[PDB]
């Protein structure tokens, strides 16, 4: 659990899920 991995947790999470197309 660094710095590096809470950008990839965080980058599916928000700024997105709109029209369901992040997963």
Same mark, same amino acid.
């Given at each position: =659990?660094?710095? =590096?991995?809470?950008?990839?947790?965080?980058?599916?999470?928000?700024?997105?899920?709109?029209?369901?197309?992040?997963?």
């Amino acid at each position: =659990e660094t710095r =590096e991995q809470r950008a990839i947790r965080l980058a599916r999470m928000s700024a997105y899920a709109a029209r369901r197309l992040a997963n």
